[PDB]
Design a protein around this ligand. Structure first.
Ligand SMILES: *[C@@H]1O[C@H](CO)[C@@H](O)[C@H](O)[C@H]1NC(=O)CCCCCCC(C)C
Ligand SMILES: *[C@@H]1O[C@H](CO)[C@@H](O)[C@H](O)[C@H]1NC(C)=O
Ligand SMILES: *[C@H]1O[C@H](CO)[C@@H](O)[C@H](O)[C@@H]1O
Ligand SMILES: [Cl-]
Lengths: 171, 7
């Protein structure tokens, strides 16, 4: 598998505008539309992004398009950052996806704040990395996700994402 | 359905 499939497991999906739990209007695979509390503003942003009158509803293709751009944008954030880029460069492709995941979640600045863990990853110290990453606020607030990402860093394998089953809670 | 999730 790869980063795209990985983030699809960790992010979920909406084809219609949704006010998420942090009080943001959102759509697609974790695509932020606006911090504004106005649904109309969310719609304006969405309509401008897609190039049509959506009324807050988009197709899978449109969701996938926003997704591909958001993944590229996370890579650009990595490469622009003095702390993240070297690490990214040193990593194999499996562990790179784990890092894109984190940035996609919390932004380059947030990920660049994991100073020691980033150092351990550069230095190929995989178990110490994992232990250190698990000490974070990130890990306390989104543990199911953080465990999978951390495991991927630890092993360099896709094991944490293999053989997962859905349990409803949508459709 | 037609919307996603997960809730
Ligand atoms: C949706 O969840 C259902 C309940 O768990 C599953 O039975 C079903 O397989 C799931 N379907 C899909 O994956 C629909 C295709 C959506 C693909 C969009 C991906 C792009 C990258 C936006
Ligand atoms: C979606 O909901 C199910 C069941 O509540 C859960 O297994 C899964 O982790 C959720 N996915 C996301 C991306 O939150
Ligand atoms: C699942 O349920 C939630 C809460 O009712 C909705 O917000 C969502 O649109 C979907 O219907
Ligand atoms: Cl950018």
């Amino acid at each position: 598998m790869n980063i795209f499939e990985m983030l699809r497991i960790d992010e979920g999906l909406r084809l219609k505008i949704y006010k998420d739990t942090e009080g943001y209007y959102t759509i697609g695979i974790g695509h932020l539309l606006t911090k504004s509390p106005s649904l109309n503003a969310a719609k304006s942003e969405l309509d401008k992004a897609i190039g049509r009158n959506t009324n807050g509803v988009i197709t899978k293709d449109e969701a996938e398009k926003l997704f591909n751009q958001d993944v590229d944008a996370a890579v650009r954030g990595i490469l622009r950052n003095a702390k993240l880029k070297p690490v990214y460069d040193s990593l194999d492709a499996v562990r790179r996806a784990a890092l894109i995941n984190m940035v996609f979640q919390m932004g380059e600045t947030g990920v660049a704040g994991f100073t020691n863990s980033l150092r351990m990853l550069q230095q190929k110290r995989w178990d110490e990395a994992a232990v250190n990453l698990a000490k974070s606020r990130w890990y306390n607030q989104t543990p199911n996700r953080a465990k999978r990402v951390i495991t991927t860093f630890r092993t360099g394998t896709w094991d944490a994402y293999k053989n997962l089953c859905a349990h409803x809670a949508x459709x | 359905x037609y919307x996603x999730x997960y809730x």
